Amino acid sequence: DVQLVESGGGLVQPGGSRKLSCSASGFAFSSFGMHWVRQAPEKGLEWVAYISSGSGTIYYADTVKGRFTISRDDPKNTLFLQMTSLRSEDTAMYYCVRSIYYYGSSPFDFWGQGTTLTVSGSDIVMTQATSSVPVTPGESVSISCRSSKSLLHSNGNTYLYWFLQRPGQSPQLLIYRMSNLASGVPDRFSGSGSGTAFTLTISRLEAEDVGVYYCMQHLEYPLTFGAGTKLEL
Amino acid sequence: ASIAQARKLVEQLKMEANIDRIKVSKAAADLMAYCEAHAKEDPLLTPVPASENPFR
Amino acid sequence: SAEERAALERSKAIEKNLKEDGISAAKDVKLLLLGADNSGKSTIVKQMKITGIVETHFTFKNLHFRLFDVGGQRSERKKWIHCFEDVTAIIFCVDLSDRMHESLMLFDSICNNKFFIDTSIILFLNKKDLFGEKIKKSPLTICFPEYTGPNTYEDAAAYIQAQFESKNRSPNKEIYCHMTCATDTNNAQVIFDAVTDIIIANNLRGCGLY
Amino acid sequence: NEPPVILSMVILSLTFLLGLPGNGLVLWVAGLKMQRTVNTIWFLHLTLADLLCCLSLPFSLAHLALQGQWPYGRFLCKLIPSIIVLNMFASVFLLTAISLDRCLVVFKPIWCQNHRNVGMACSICGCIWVVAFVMCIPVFVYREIFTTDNHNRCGYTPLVAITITRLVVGFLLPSVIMIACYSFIVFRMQRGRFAKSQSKTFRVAVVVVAVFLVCWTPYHIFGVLSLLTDPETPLGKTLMSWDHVCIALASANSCFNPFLYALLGKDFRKKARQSI
Amino acid sequence: ELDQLRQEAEQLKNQIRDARKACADATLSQITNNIDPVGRIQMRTRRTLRGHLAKIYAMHWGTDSRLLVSASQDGKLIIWDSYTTNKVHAIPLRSSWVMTCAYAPSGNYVACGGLDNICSIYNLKTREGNVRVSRELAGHTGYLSCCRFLDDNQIVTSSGDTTCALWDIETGQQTTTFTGHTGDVMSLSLAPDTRLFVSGACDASAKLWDVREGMCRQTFTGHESDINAICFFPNGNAFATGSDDATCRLFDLRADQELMTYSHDNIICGITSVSFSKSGRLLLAGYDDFNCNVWDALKADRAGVLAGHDNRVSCLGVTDDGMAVATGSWDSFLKIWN
Known about the structure:
The complex is a heteropentamer. Chain B is mostly helical. Chain B has helices spanning about 1-15, 25-35.
């Protein structure tokens, strides 16, 4: 089926360079926009770069512009990220994400596997109040995520995303646009909110629902992730 | 050949001729009542202001 | 415009794809093939190389001919004949050996049709030698009661050509006739030259100078 | 109010009043009502150039009424009698391109079906605009201001080369190409399926050529004869008196063009009738 | 025994005609004479969708009153966004001889048919991102004229070989077939409850079927030429059929006869498409005379005209919520009025 295998990560000396490849198969790579998301060893996710379908628009983060660059090879079905001048804070495990956009689409639906890379002002501030909650099976847990600005656009759509990252796996999209349940997700997951304050409700929590939950906004680039509320057994 | 076709045609006619029919006046009355009752919710015969129409 | 810009980009890309597809497909030469049943249509469609509609496309002298054999639709013509307009020409095939009153009626019906008031007809007459043998065996007055003259092959052929060609009335179209026996490879040059003449006429009409 | 100049105002007024309605209506129809076939682009660009000429006609009226001595700034006389030349030469070159297309769509029917689309016509029209703009630079750079009297008039190798270039690229190639092309088109229509025709095509070709050659030739004749005849003499005074009539005829050709090109396209005639 | 059967058929037809005549006591015009007319209806073009390059033959509205699918002879089937005039999908067809299109109520599938005698179903919500041909229903010997999605699993199609057949997209087999028409069936419309449908044949007759049992119920013959379009009243108890005789008529299911005729002296072109309004008071019909006329369904008089098309209008459709109307024509331009 759909497969996104990426490789090319390893021990890199400071000040060097490394070239990463994201091999894609099983889907039409030509019409899909690809992102790049990294995750610190003890911190949350952090958006890095973005390439559109047809290599139209390219964006970079505040700490990423100039050093990094994102390119794709549509006939070869690969996504490339040439990253240069590695500082000490660039260590992470980089993911590969497909985010096709149209009316009613489901961006960030499929995530890659990840390659470890052991290296030797007006943005929307989106924060989760609580960073750790203890839960038990059979109970209901609610996670909240406040946004600095109003995420409700004039067209009636609010851009809030919810992700779950199970231990040892990759994040899986659960709720897109703060109200729509992604395909394959069990119906017990629900989301709500109003303009600034958003909340996600989990009913009949099970042993497979343990992990860390993140909130994300897509109103404008750059994209800011939440602190990440961790729910443990 | 033609015998089967004639039998099918006469069977169809017999089965069709046994349909109950209401008066025309009652049908006209109920069409008119339906047309009048839903007159408020009709963005076409009653123009909608530019504030409340998506096709601005 | 927050993320609808990607949707706009996608719409523009597929609009460009549609435009490119239309420009690429506008270069094809379309031809409509008609005629009575068992009149040699299969022979000619298999003679220039290569269930409802059967399309036989081939290339000759840089002209991509798209020939549509629509003889498989046994239904009312008037409900689907209007979609075959804008065609370059209509090929009409008639069996000279046999099935002639029906051919004349069909030619009269298809030549005076409302949608085909400007499309010229390329008329073919195969099975010439079968007709000559039949003339040597039986007179040509059997098919046409009102035929008077010598009973030679050339006379009969010219008379049939005149009867077929007299059915048209529109000044803007002409009927091209040719003789064939189906044992020949000349059934492609005639279509080519007729199509070139029709192209010149259509271009002159479009420029307004004609 | 001398005859040679009052006639110039009469011709300019009739040309304006016959062209602005016709050019405006034809432009509106070809821009919105009509589709984007290959042949429509030539008419669109020709009507654009003729509307530019008609809109620059009031500048000519003001110049003739004041006997020169433009009261505006330098930039106005640097602009107007350069856009005028650009409009006239663009009209001439688009007429030549229309003739070339008319021969091409006939003598090569096979090629003109594969490699013939709207893009080629648009590129050719852009090339015409570019070459006209490039060729109308000398009148823009060799412009000078000289009062020499009570009022400040506008005027100016400097004159022989520009006159020869204008006459060549406005008279020889256009007329020769047009005549040869229409002769070839008439000849080709005498072979078969066209014998009933060749009576209307010949008339159209000859009337178009006659109008083109009666509307433009005096202008070049007197432009050269001014270089041949010295000034301050009646031979030259008559020339400058009739130069206004020559310019009036040159403007009149612009309004005459739509009535011989746009309105001969019966479908366009029906579309314009429906629109009006 | 042929003569006896013919006599029985003739007397049955006479009895049917007598019963239909007996139920008529007062016409529709006689009862709606004391109501106020709707007045002049001014409709203006709000959006224009210019994507097609050939003659547009069919179109359908989305169940959310926002998406729209259009099919043309160019061999493509584009999905339109009504609110923003964007294009979401461009599906290339196998055969360019297309005469119908349908859009699934759930929004997952899009049908297509034509001179190729095969109904093709396409899958929109595919995991790989592209649209793939899910099935190819091939059981007809004649051109398919209409097809409507009953649900995501079964679809009913009308064919030009004097037959209508209910299909099963899961296995691709004709579950039920409807026969009885003498000529080509060029129109089809489904009930609001999807429990029964009617067909309009080329022999100037209209029959009432039901999908479950699979047998004709009632026949309505009042026209003089081929019927080109048909559509139910919103209540589901009446329908209007437009023919080539330059007239469209209103038939009543319960009365089983005509109600009114919608004809004008200055009208000669035949009807190509008929549709109703949300409340059923306005009946918009497309004409071959280059214009679309808005007919008052109860007063039987023209309330306005929809002019602005350069060719014959092939299809027309009102949104599910009644906000706007869309018309497609042979000049490859699709217009939204409001």
